[PDB]
Design an enzyme around this catalytic site. Structure first.
Site, short mmCIF file in Angstrom:
data_model
loop_
_atom_site.label_atom_id
_atom_site.label_comp_id
_atom_site.label_asym_id
_atom_site.label_seq_id
_atom_site.Cartn_x
_atom_site.Cartn_y
_atom_site.Cartn_z
N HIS A 88 0.73 -1.19 -0.02
CA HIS A 88 -0.05 0.03 -0.01
C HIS A 88 0.74 1.23 0.02
O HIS A 88 0.35 2.37 -0.30
CB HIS A 88 -0.79 -0.05 1.22
CG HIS A 88 -1.98 -0.98 1.39
ND1 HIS A 88 -2.73 -1.21 0.12
CD2 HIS A 88 -2.05 -2.06 2.24
CE1 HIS A 88 -3.65 -2.36 0.57
NE2 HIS A 88 -3.28 -2.81 1.74
N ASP B 245 -2.33 -11.01 -1.97
CA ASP B 245 -2.91 -10.30 -0.76
C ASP B 245 -4.34 -10.07 -1.12
O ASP B 245 -4.57 -9.61 -2.21
CB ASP B 245 -2.05 -9.06 -0.36
CG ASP B 245 -2.68 -8.45 0.75
OD1 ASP B 245 -3.53 -7.83 1.00
OD2 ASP B 245 -2.00 -8.57 1.95
N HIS C 253 -5.94 -7.61 -0.51
CA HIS C 253 -6.13 -6.00 -0.64
C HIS C 253 -5.32 -5.76 -2.27
O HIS C 253 -4.43 -6.31 -2.30
CB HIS C 253 -5.67 -5.14 0.53
CG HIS C 253 -6.50 -5.55 1.86
ND1 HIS C 253 -5.76 -6.42 2.59
CD2 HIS C 253 -7.71 -5.37 2.01
CE1 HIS C 253 -6.69 -6.26 3.75
NE2 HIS C 253 -8.08 -5.76 3.36
N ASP D 108 -4.13 -12.76 3.73
CA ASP D 108 -5.19 -12.26 4.47
C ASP D 108 -6.66 -12.83 3.47
O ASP D 108 -7.57 -12.49 4.06
CB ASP D 108 -5.35 -11.03 4.47
CG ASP D 108 -4.64 -9.92 3.62
OD1 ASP D 108 -4.37 -10.36 2.37
OD2 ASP D 108 -4.55 -8.66 3.89
C1 LIG Z 1 -9.54 0.78 9.60
C2 LIG Z 1 -8.87 -0.38 10.43
C3 LIG Z 1 -9.74 -0.43 11.65
S1 LIG Z 1 -8.78 -1.96 9.63
O1 LIG Z 1 -7.70 -2.56 10.37
O2 LIG Z 1 -9.97 -3.01 9.84
N1 LIG Z 1 -8.45 -1.63 8.17
C4 LIG Z 1 -7.07 -1.33 7.72
C5 LIG Z 1 -6.30 -2.35 6.90
C6 LIG Z 1 -5.38 -1.78 6.15
C7 LIG Z 1 -4.41 -2.56 5.10
C8 LIG Z 1 -4.73 -4.28 5.66
C9 LIG Z 1 -4.01 -4.85 4.86
O3 LIG Z 1 -3.83 -6.26 4.95
N2 LIG Z 1 -3.53 -4.70 3.51
O4 LIG Z 1 -2.72 -5.46 2.49
C10 LIG Z 1 -5.55 -4.43 6.41
C11 LIG Z 1 -6.41 -3.69 7.30
C12 LIG Z 1 -9.43 -1.36 6.95
C13 LIG Z 1 -10.07 -2.95 6.65
C14 LIG Z 1 -11.11 -3.32 6.90
C15 LIG Z 1 -11.81 -4.87 6.38
C16 LIG Z 1 -10.74 -5.36 5.74
N3 LIG Z 1 -9.62 -4.84 5.30
C17 LIG Z 1 -9.27 -3.74 5.63
K LIG Z 2 -3.93 -8.18 -4.11
ZN LIG Z 3 -3.98 -7.25 2.88
#
Ligand SMILES: CC(C)S(=O)(=O)N(Cc1ccc(C(=O)NO)cc1)Cc1cccnc1
Ligand SMILES: [K+]
Ligand SMILES: [Zn+2]
Ligand SMILES: [K+]
Length: 354
Positions: A133, A171, A173, A264
């Site tokens: 990110h 990942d 995300h 994840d």
């Molecule tokens: C806003 C926070 C409390 S959060 O923790 O819930 N979140 C921040 C977050 C950023 C990056 C990663 C990652 O793994 N990136 O590769 C994972 C979490 C938002 C969210 C929520 C539901 C699923 N995914 C992300």
């Molecule tokens: K990805």
């Molecule tokens: Zn992720």
């Protein structure tokens, strides 16, 4: 055929002073390392030493302003750290964070160097904080510097500028930072699979949609595979690899493969909501090993169920070591819709899809 592994316990020092149970835990990396020892995989790998990335290396992808501000956090007071972290989307910072991020990147550089000089065939990097990110100019989503993007440029710096690097980002995300860093670049092919939900899932940007194919000389060299409406798992990931990732990758013919290997999307993850199994990740790794004469570097990104990530990553390493893939619901209709949209978007650029 040697498999490298890099791990340094001092990447555990980055921590969240206000919320010690925050999911991006120090023990993510120690648990993965422990599982490798428990399964007797660690002794089968060559241990590659970790090192700190230099500021000059960071400048391969990041601005001087961003490097300077993160660097300064090493000597900040708690209030300074809290306010600085709150300038970004989903970042916490301790006095150890900058050094840990340097260690994550330098570990990956040493691994890439070992692959590219023929010391090892492939490698796994058990590193944190994550990277995908992070943008040229900003930190985001637990990531300070974009480890995988930096490793691609580092690889080019020790070979030739045009070395063809494939980054597969599994990942759950979208790696917004990696896409943006290489959006105008045809020497790095970026393929991301990710939960999208029509832009509602983090990082909450339509940049992750299938119609973002790259810009300028990079048109065609950015492949987004976005999932909507469904708890995707092994069948959906295998289908995307069969129809999109592997045909495109083979046509690109990378000389080095980097995996932005978040776990994840794994069954059990507290955030991803998906159900890829360890055997599923093993099959994805084994497919990628058919590319680039096996020159594959697996880099940890996210993944927050300590048991799931430890089982999943250790199985990927089992595949890198040459172990036979273990044996694997009906394919979800929504996944086929996504695959067909990507096929339409990238047919102009990849003859293997026509
Ligand atoms: C806003 C926070 C409390 S959060 O923790 O819930 N979140 C921040 C977050 C950023 C990056 C990663 C990652 O793994 N990136 O590769 C994972 C979490 C938002 C969210 C929520 C539901 C699923 N995914 C992300
Ligand atoms: K990805
Ligand atoms: Zn992720
Ligand atoms: K690109």
């Amino acid at each position: 055929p040697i498999t490298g592994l890099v791990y340094d316990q001092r990447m555990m020092l980055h921590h969240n002073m206000w919320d010690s149970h925050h999911p991006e835990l120090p023990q993510r990396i120690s648990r993965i390392f422990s599982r490798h020892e428990e399964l007797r995989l660690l002794s089968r790998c060559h241990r590659i030493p970790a090192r700190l990335a230099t500021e000059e290396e960071l400048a391969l992808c990041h601005s001087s302003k961003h490097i300077s501000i993160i660097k300064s956090s090493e000597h900040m007071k708690p209030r300074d750290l809290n306010r600085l972290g709150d300038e970004y989307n989903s970042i916490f910072i301790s006095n150890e964070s900058y050094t840990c991020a340097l260690l994550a990147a330098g570990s990956c550089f040493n691994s890439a160097q070992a692959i590219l000089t023929g010391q090892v065939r492939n490698a796994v990097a058990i590193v944190r904080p994550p990277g995908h990110h992070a943008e040229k100019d900003t930190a985001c989503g637990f990531c300070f510097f974009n480890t995988a993007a930096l490793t691609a440029r580092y690889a080019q710096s020790i070979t030739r500028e045009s070395l063809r690097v494939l980054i597969v980002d599994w990942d759950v995300h979208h790696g917004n930072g990696t896409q943006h860093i290489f959006e105008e670049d045809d020497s790095v092919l970026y393929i991301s699979l990710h939960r999208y939900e029509d832009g509602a899932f983090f990082p909450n940007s339509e940049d992750a949609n299938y119609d973002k194919v790259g810009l300028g000389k990079g048109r065609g060299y950015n492949v987004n595979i976005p999932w909507n409406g469904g708890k995707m798992g092994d069948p959906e990931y295998m289908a995307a690899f069969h129809h999109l990732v592997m045909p495109i990758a083979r046509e690109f013919a990378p000389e080095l493969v980097l995996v932005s290997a978040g776990f994840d999307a794994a069954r059990g993850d507290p955030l991803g909501g998906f159900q890829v199994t360890p055997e599923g990740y093993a099959h994805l790794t084994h497919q990628l090993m058919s590319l680039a004469a096996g020159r594959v570097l697996i880099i940890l990104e996210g993944g927050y169920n300590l048991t799931s990530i430890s089982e999943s990553m250790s199985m990927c390493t089992s595949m890198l070591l040459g172990d036979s893939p273990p044996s694997l619901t009906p394919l979800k209709t929504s996944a086929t819709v996504s695959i067909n949209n990507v096929l339409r978007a990238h047919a102009p650029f990849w003859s293997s899809l026509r």
